[PDB]
Coordinates of C-alpha atoms in Angstrom, one line a residue:
Chain F
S397 CA -2.2 1.2 64.8
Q398 CA -1.9 -3.1 65.0
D399 CA -3.0 -4.0 61.4
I400 CA -0.9 -1.1 59.3
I401 CA 2.4 -2.9 60.6
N402 CA 1.3 -6.4 59.6
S403 CA -0.6 -5.4 56.5
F404 CA 2.4 -3.5 55.1
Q405 CA 4.6 -6.7 56.1
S406 CA 2.3 -8.8 54.1
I407 CA 2.5 -6.7 50.9
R408 CA 6.4 -6.9 50.9
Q409 CA 6.6 -10.5 50.9
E410 CA 3.8 -11.3 48.3
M411 CA 6.1 -9.2 45.6
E412 CA 8.3 -12.1 45.2
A413 CA 6.1 -14.7 43.4
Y414 CA 5.0 -12.5 40.3
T415 CA 4.2 -12.0 36.7
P416 CA 1.9 -14.4 35.7
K417 CA 0.1 -13.3 32.5
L418 CA -1.4 -16.1 29.9
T419 CA -4.4 -17.8 32.2
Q420 CA -4.0 -16.0 35.5
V421 CA -5.2 -12.3 34.0
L422 CA -8.5 -13.1 33.1
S423 CA -11.0 -16.4 32.9
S424 CA -13.7 -17.3 30.1
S425 CA -16.5 -17.3 32.5
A426 CA -16.4 -13.5 34.2
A427 CA -15.6 -11.9 31.0
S428 CA -18.1 -13.3 29.3
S429 CA -20.5 -11.9 32.0
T430 CA -19.0 -8.8 31.5
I431 CA -20.2 -9.1 28.0
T432 CA -24.2 -9.1 29.6
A433 CA -22.9 -6.0 32.2
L434 CA -22.4 -3.2 29.2
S435 CA -24.6 -4.3 26.7
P436 CA -28.0 -2.3 26.3
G437 CA -30.0 -4.7 28.5
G438 CA -27.6 -5.1 31.5
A439 CA -26.9 -2.3 33.7
Chain C
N18 CA -2.2 -2.3 -0.7
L19 CA -1.8 -5.3 1.7
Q20 CA -5.1 -6.3 2.8
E21 CA -6.2 -6.1 -0.7
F22 CA -3.6 -9.0 -1.6
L23 CA -4.7 -11.0 1.6
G24 CA -8.4 -10.6 0.4
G25 CA -8.7 -12.1 -2.7
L26 CA -6.5 -15.5 -0.9
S27 CA -8.3 -18.8 -0.1
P28 CA -8.8 -19.9 3.5
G29 CA -6.3 -23.0 2.8
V30 CA -3.6 -20.9 3.2
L31 CA -4.8 -18.0 5.6
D32 CA -4.9 -21.0 8.3
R33 CA -1.1 -22.4 7.9
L34 CA 0.1 -18.1 7.6
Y35 CA -0.9 -17.6 11.1
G36 CA 2.8 -17.9 13.0
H37 CA 3.1 -16.4 16.9
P38 CA 5.2 -13.3 16.7
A39 CA 4.7 -12.2 12.9
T40 CA 1.3 -12.7 10.8
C41 CA -1.3 -12.3 14.1
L42 CA 0.5 -9.1 14.6
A43 CA 0.6 -7.8 11.1
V44 CA -3.1 -8.2 9.8
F45 CA -4.3 -6.6 13.3
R46 CA -1.8 -3.6 12.9
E47 CA -3.8 -2.8 9.7
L48 CA -7.2 -2.8 10.1
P49 CA -8.8 0.6 9.5
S50 CA -10.2 2.1 13.1
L51 CA -12.8 0.4 14.6
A52 CA -12.1 -3.5 13.6
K53 CA -9.0 -2.8 16.2
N54 CA -11.5 -2.6 19.1
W55 CA -13.6 -5.6 18.4
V56 CA -10.5 -8.3 18.0
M57 CA -9.7 -7.0 21.5
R58 CA -12.9 -7.3 23.0
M59 CA -13.4 -10.7 22.2
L60 CA -9.9 -12.1 22.4
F61 CA -10.5 -13.2 25.7
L62 CA -13.6 -14.4 25.5
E63 CA -15.2 -18.3 24.5
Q64 CA -18.2 -18.3 24.0
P65 CA -19.9 -16.5 21.1
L66 CA -21.3 -13.7 21.7
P67 CA -24.8 -12.7 19.4
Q68 CA -24.9 -11.4 16.3
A69 CA -27.2 -8.6 16.7
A70 CA -24.9 -7.1 19.2
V71 CA -22.2 -5.8 17.2
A72 CA -24.0 -3.5 15.0
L73 CA -25.7 -1.6 18.3
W74 CA -22.4 -1.7 19.7
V75 CA -21.9 1.7 17.1
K76 CA -23.8 5.0 17.2
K77 CA -26.4 5.7 14.6
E78 CA -23.7 8.7 13.1
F79 CA -21.1 6.7 11.8
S80 CA -23.1 3.3 11.0
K81 CA -21.4 3.5 7.4
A82 CA -18.2 2.6 8.8
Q83 CA -19.7 -0.5 11.0
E84 CA -20.1 -2.6 8.0
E85 CA -16.7 -1.8 6.0
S86 CA -14.7 -2.5 8.8
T87 CA -16.4 -6.1 9.3
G88 CA -16.6 -6.4 5.8
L89 CA -12.7 -6.4 5.8
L90 CA -12.6 -8.2 9.2
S91 CA -14.3 -11.2 7.7
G92 CA -13.1 -10.8 4.6
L93 CA -9.5 -12.0 6.1
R94 CA -11.8 -14.9 7.8
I95 CA -11.1 -13.7 11.6
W96 CA -14.0 -14.4 12.4
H97 CA -17.7 -16.2 11.3
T98 CA -21.0 -16.8 12.1
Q99 CA -21.3 -20.1 14.2
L100 CA -25.1 -20.1 14.9
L108 CA -18.9 -14.2 16.4
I109 CA -16.5 -16.5 17.6
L110 CA -12.8 -15.2 16.3
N111 CA -10.7 -18.3 14.6
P112 CA -8.9 -21.0 17.1
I113 CA -5.5 -20.1 15.0
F114 CA -6.1 -16.6 14.9
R115 CA -7.1 -16.4 18.7
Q116 CA -4.3 -18.1 20.2
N117 CA -1.2 -16.8 18.0
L118 CA -2.4 -13.3 18.7
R119 CA -2.4 -13.9 22.8
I120 CA 1.0 -14.8 22.2
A121 CA 2.1 -11.5 20.7
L122 CA 0.6 -10.9 24.4
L123 CA 3.2 -11.9 26.4
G124 CA 2.9 -15.4 25.4
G125 CA 4.4 -18.7 25.0
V145 CA 25.0 -1.0 15.0
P146 CA 25.3 2.6 12.7
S147 CA 26.8 0.1 10.2
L148 CA 23.6 -1.6 9.8
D149 CA 22.0 1.8 8.6
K150 CA 24.5 3.5 6.5
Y151 CA 24.9 -0.1 4.1
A152 CA 21.0 -0.4 3.9
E153 CA 20.8 3.6 2.0
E154 CA 23.6 3.2 -0.2
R155 CA 22.4 -0.3 -1.2
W156 CA 19.1 0.4 -2.1
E157 CA 19.8 3.5 -4.0
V158 CA 21.6 1.3 -6.9
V159 CA 17.9 -0.5 -7.3
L160 CA 17.0 2.9 -8.2
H161 CA 19.7 4.1 -10.4
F162 CA 18.9 1.5 -12.6
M163 CA 15.9 3.1 -13.7
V164 CA 18.1 6.0 -14.6
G165 CA 20.5 6.2 -17.5
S166 CA 24.0 5.8 -14.9
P167 CA 27.2 3.8 -15.8
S168 CA 26.7 2.8 -12.3
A169 CA 23.4 0.2 -12.5
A170 CA 23.3 -3.0 -10.7
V171 CA 24.7 -5.2 -12.5
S172 CA 22.6 -8.7 -11.6
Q173 CA 20.9 -10.5 -14.5
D174 CA 18.2 -12.4 -12.0
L175 CA 17.0 -8.4 -10.8
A176 CA 16.7 -7.2 -14.6
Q177 CA 14.4 -10.0 -15.5
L178 CA 12.6 -9.9 -12.1
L179 CA 11.7 -5.9 -13.2
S180 CA 10.7 -6.7 -16.7
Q181 CA 8.1 -9.2 -15.7
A182 CA 7.0 -6.7 -12.9
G183 CA 6.3 -4.4 -15.4
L184 CA 8.2 -1.4 -14.7
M185 CA 11.3 -2.0 -17.1
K186 CA 10.5 -2.5 -20.9
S187 CA 12.3 -4.3 -23.1
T188 CA 10.8 -5.1 -26.8
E189 CA 14.5 -6.4 -28.2
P190 CA 17.5 -8.1 -26.4
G191 CA 18.8 -4.7 -25.7
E192 CA 21.8 -3.3 -24.1
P193 CA 19.9 -1.3 -21.7
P194 CA 16.2 -1.5 -20.4
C195 CA 14.4 1.4 -21.0
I196 CA 11.6 3.0 -18.6
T197 CA 8.1 2.9 -19.1
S198 CA 5.3 4.8 -17.8
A199 CA 4.6 2.8 -14.8
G200 CA 8.5 3.0 -13.6
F201 CA 8.8 6.8 -13.7
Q202 CA 5.8 6.4 -11.5
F203 CA 7.8 4.0 -8.9
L204 CA 10.6 6.3 -9.1
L205 CA 8.0 9.0 -6.9
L206 CA 6.4 6.7 -4.6
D207 CA 7.5 6.6 -0.9
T208 CA 10.5 4.8 0.9
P209 CA 8.3 2.1 2.7
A210 CA 5.2 2.4 0.0
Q211 CA 7.7 1.8 -3.2
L212 CA 8.7 -1.6 -1.2
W213 CA 5.3 -3.1 -0.4
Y214 CA 4.6 -2.5 -4.2
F215 CA 7.9 -4.5 -5.2
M216 CA 7.0 -7.3 -2.8
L217 CA 3.7 -8.0 -4.3
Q218 CA 5.5 -9.0 -7.6
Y219 CA 7.9 -10.7 -5.7
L220 CA 5.0 -12.9 -4.6
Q221 CA 2.6 -12.9 -7.0
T222 CA 5.1 -15.1 -9.1
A223 CA 6.6 -16.7 -6.5
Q224 CA 4.3 -19.7 -6.6
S225 CA 5.3 -21.1 -10.1
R226 CA 9.4 -20.0 -9.8
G227 CA 9.8 -20.0 -6.4
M228 CA 8.0 -21.3 -3.2
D229 CA 5.3 -21.6 -1.5
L230 CA 4.0 -18.0 -0.5
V231 CA 3.0 -19.2 3.1
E232 CA 6.6 -19.3 4.7
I233 CA 7.8 -16.2 2.7
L234 CA 5.4 -13.8 4.1
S235 CA 5.3 -14.7 7.3
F236 CA 9.4 -14.2 6.8
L237 CA 8.8 -11.1 6.2
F238 CA 6.4 -10.2 8.8
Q239 CA 9.2 -11.5 11.5
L240 CA 11.4 -9.7 9.6
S241 CA 9.5 -6.5 10.1
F242 CA 9.8 -6.3 13.8
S255 CA 13.8 -24.2 5.3
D256 CA 16.7 -25.1 2.8
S257 CA 14.5 -22.7 0.3
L258 CA 14.3 -19.8 2.7
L259 CA 18.0 -19.0 2.2
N260 CA 17.9 -18.2 -1.6
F261 CA 15.3 -15.7 -0.8
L262 CA 17.6 -14.4 1.7
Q263 CA 20.1 -13.7 -1.0
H264 CA 17.5 -11.5 -2.8
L265 CA 16.9 -9.6 0.0
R266 CA 20.8 -9.2 0.4
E267 CA 20.2 -6.9 -3.2
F268 CA 18.0 -4.1 -2.2
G269 CA 18.9 -4.2 1.5
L270 CA 17.0 -5.5 4.1
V271 CA 19.8 -8.0 5.7
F272 CA 23.2 -7.6 5.9
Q273 CA 25.5 -10.8 6.1
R274 CA 28.9 -9.1 5.9
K275 CA 30.9 -12.6 6.1
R276 CA 29.3 -14.2 2.7
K277 CA 26.6 -16.4 3.8
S278 CA 26.9 -17.0 8.1
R279 CA 24.2 -18.5 10.0
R280 CA 22.0 -15.4 11.1
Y281 CA 21.3 -12.4 8.8
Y282 CA 21.3 -8.6 10.4
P283 CA 17.9 -6.7 9.8
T284 CA 18.2 -3.5 8.3
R285 CA 16.0 0.2 8.9
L286 CA 14.2 -0.4 5.7
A287 CA 12.9 -3.9 6.6
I288 CA 10.4 -1.7 8.8
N289 CA 7.5 -2.1 6.1
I307 CA 13.6 20.3 0.6
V308 CA 11.7 23.4 1.1
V309 CA 9.7 24.7 -2.0
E310 CA 8.4 28.6 -1.8
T311 CA 5.6 30.6 -3.2
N312 CA 7.7 31.9 -6.5
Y313 CA 7.9 28.1 -7.3
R314 CA 11.4 27.8 -6.5
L315 CA 12.2 24.4 -4.5
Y316 CA 15.8 24.2 -2.7
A317 CA 16.3 20.5 -1.8
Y318 CA 19.1 20.1 0.9
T319 CA 20.6 16.7 -0.6
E320 CA 23.8 15.9 -2.4
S321 CA 22.4 12.1 -3.1
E322 CA 22.8 11.7 -7.2
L323 CA 19.4 10.1 -6.9
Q324 CA 17.1 12.3 -5.1
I325 CA 18.8 15.4 -7.6
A326 CA 17.6 13.5 -10.7
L327 CA 14.3 12.6 -9.3
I328 CA 13.3 16.7 -9.2
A329 CA 14.6 16.9 -12.3
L330 CA 12.0 14.4 -13.5
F331 CA 9.8 18.0 -13.1
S332 CA 11.8 20.9 -12.5
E333 CA 14.6 22.0 -14.1
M334 CA 18.2 23.3 -12.2
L335 CA 19.7 26.7 -11.7
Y336 CA 22.4 26.2 -9.6
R337 CA 24.2 23.4 -7.5
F338 CA 26.3 23.8 -4.4
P339 CA 27.6 21.3 -2.5
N340 CA 24.7 20.1 -0.1
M341 CA 22.3 22.4 -2.0
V342 CA 20.5 22.4 -5.2
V343 CA 17.6 24.7 -6.2
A344 CA 15.6 24.0 -8.8
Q345 CA 11.9 25.6 -10.3
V346 CA 8.2 23.9 -11.3
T347 CA 7.6 25.8 -14.2
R348 CA 5.0 25.4 -16.9
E349 CA 7.1 23.6 -19.3
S350 CA 8.8 21.0 -16.9
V351 CA 5.7 19.3 -15.3
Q352 CA 3.9 19.2 -18.9
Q353 CA 7.4 17.8 -19.8
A354 CA 6.8 14.9 -17.0
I355 CA 3.1 14.5 -17.4
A356 CA 3.3 13.7 -21.3
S357 CA 4.9 10.8 -20.1
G358 CA 2.8 10.6 -17.3
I359 CA 4.1 11.1 -14.1
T360 CA 0.7 13.0 -13.4
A361 CA 0.4 16.0 -10.3
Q362 CA -1.2 13.9 -7.9
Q363 CA 2.2 12.2 -7.8
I364 CA 4.4 14.9 -7.9
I365 CA 2.4 16.7 -4.7
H366 CA 2.7 13.8 -2.8
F367 CA 6.7 13.7 -3.4
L368 CA 7.4 16.9 -2.2
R369 CA 4.6 16.6 1.1
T370 CA 6.9 13.4 2.4
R371 CA 9.9 14.7 1.3
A372 CA 9.3 18.3 3.0
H373 CA 11.8 20.1 5.2
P374 CA 11.5 21.0 8.8
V375 CA 10.9 24.1 8.5
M376 CA 8.2 23.6 6.1
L377 CA 6.6 21.4 8.7
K378 CA 5.6 23.8 10.9
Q379 CA 2.4 25.6 11.9
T380 CA 1.6 26.2 8.1
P381 CA 0.0 23.8 6.0
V382 CA 2.6 22.2 3.9
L383 CA 3.0 22.8 -0.1
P384 CA 1.4 26.3 0.4
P385 CA -1.8 26.0 -1.8
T386 CA -0.9 28.3 -4.4
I387 CA 2.0 26.0 -5.9
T388 CA -0.3 23.0 -4.6
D389 CA -3.1 23.9 -7.4
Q390 CA -0.8 25.2 -10.1
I391 CA 0.5 22.2 -10.4
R392 CA -3.0 20.4 -10.5
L393 CA -4.2 22.8 -13.1
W394 CA -1.3 22.6 -15.4
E395 CA -2.4 19.0 -15.8
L396 CA -5.5 19.8 -17.1
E397 CA -4.1 21.8 -20.3
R398 CA -3.6 17.8 -21.3
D399 CA -7.2 16.8 -20.3
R400 CA -8.9 19.2 -22.9
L401 CA -9.8 17.5 -26.0
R402 CA -10.5 13.6 -24.8
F403 CA -10.2 11.6 -27.8
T404 CA -12.2 8.5 -27.9
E405 CA -13.6 6.0 -31.1
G406 CA -16.8 5.8 -32.4
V407 CA -19.0 5.2 -35.7
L408 CA -22.1 7.4 -36.7
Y409 CA -25.2 6.4 -38.4
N410 CA -28.2 8.7 -39.9
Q411 CA -30.2 9.6 -43.0
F412 CA -33.0 8.1 -41.8
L413 CA -36.8 9.4 -42.2
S414 CA -38.6 7.3 -40.3
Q415 CA -39.5 9.2 -37.0
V416 CA -39.6 5.9 -34.7
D417 CA -36.8 4.1 -36.0
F418 CA -33.8 6.5 -34.2
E419 CA -36.2 5.5 -30.9
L420 CA -36.4 1.9 -32.2
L421 CA -32.7 1.5 -32.2
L422 CA -32.3 2.3 -28.1
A423 CA -33.9 -0.8 -27.5
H424 CA -31.1 -2.3 -29.0
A425 CA -28.1 0.1 -28.6
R426 CA -28.1 0.3 -24.7
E427 CA -27.9 -3.2 -23.7
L428 CA -24.3 -4.0 -24.9
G429 CA -22.6 -1.2 -23.4
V430 CA -21.4 -0.2 -27.0
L431 CA -22.9 3.3 -27.3
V432 CA -21.6 6.4 -26.4
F433 CA -23.4 9.6 -26.7
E434 CA -27.1 10.4 -26.7
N435 CA -28.3 13.1 -29.3
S436 CA -32.7 14.4 -28.7
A437 CA -33.0 17.0 -31.7
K438 CA -31.6 15.0 -34.8
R439 CA -30.8 11.4 -32.2
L440 CA -27.5 10.5 -33.7
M441 CA -26.5 7.3 -32.0
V442 CA -22.5 6.4 -31.7
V443 CA -21.7 2.9 -31.1
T444 CA -17.5 2.0 -31.3
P445 CA -16.3 -0.5 -34.0
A446 CA -15.8 -3.2 -31.7
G447 CA -19.5 -3.0 -31.0
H448 CA -20.8 -2.0 -34.6
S449 CA -20.5 -5.2 -36.3
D450 CA -23.4 -6.5 -34.6
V451 CA -25.7 -3.0 -34.9
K452 CA -25.9 -3.2 -38.7
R453 CA -27.1 -6.7 -39.0
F454 CA -30.3 -5.4 -36.7
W455 CA -30.9 -2.7 -39.3
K456 CA -31.1 -4.7 -42.0
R457 CA -33.0 -7.6 -40.4
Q458 CA -35.7 -5.9 -38.7

């Protein structure tokens, strides 16, 4: 029971710096490769 | 319609039309069913996907809705071929809309818009503003044909009264925008101002025209900023032909009297009746029965908007069946020619008759060919000169 008390600690400090929206939500490279994933020739 | 107007437009103004909160959200809000999905799919893309992909993203069933969507979606010039990457002016400003980059307001709007509609009826409390009378007559719903102490109301003005309250305003701005190119300002800044109102120096003069119909509220005689109203967002009927109307506004009563007849008038209720001799009194000017049914379905009572289909079906085709008594004996003009013993020449004349688009009726026994008198002056030349 040692990693629960710090992972709950690490997620509390993370929620102060928040909401980037413009470029930090997606990238042009990863979203374009996703088009190949849901194409009829992909997965 | 909105996309009817933007379809007949040059690309030289649509690129400067796309402001960040106003226009890119407005054109995106009117895209039919599936065009809204493709714009959101390639909103975050940068490399153009191949052209054969979007044909295969739909089923074989409902494949006809694919081309009419992209026919509009390329008609407004949102993407192009590029070899379908979107417009860089459109993709940038729409991404701004995804977080990028007081009862006095309402009661003023209804009483200021009602006096605009009272100008189209006979009333001494008319909208006394000479700029609006010349605005309506060039739009084509206030016939004068004289100087005139009153202005008359033509057949198109009768159809304007029974249009919906958002839908009659879009027909009104489209005639404001179509004539403002030579008397007002550029089309770009006035159209993007309406869409920014939906959510220079010459633009203050356009604001004082919206002050007359009621979409802004000044309240202190042309201050710095305005106050938008609820107009700037964009009764029962029985089996025995009676309609009871819980309104008391004098405009809404005379709109019932166009196609009904009054028989009592209490406070807060008016009972009228849809009869044969009163619908045909309205159709004879032309307020035709597809507009009467749409008038009562948008203005219906909450107790009518229940588990039954609204406007119960006995009364919704009896108004249609009373329209078709005018539909008998459709007159049309023509000129005849006959009395030829040649049994090939009436067949020979068919090769010289159909290609102008002037023939009306065809016969096979005696073969009466009838031509309009606008196209009769040249068919008489062919008969005498072989």
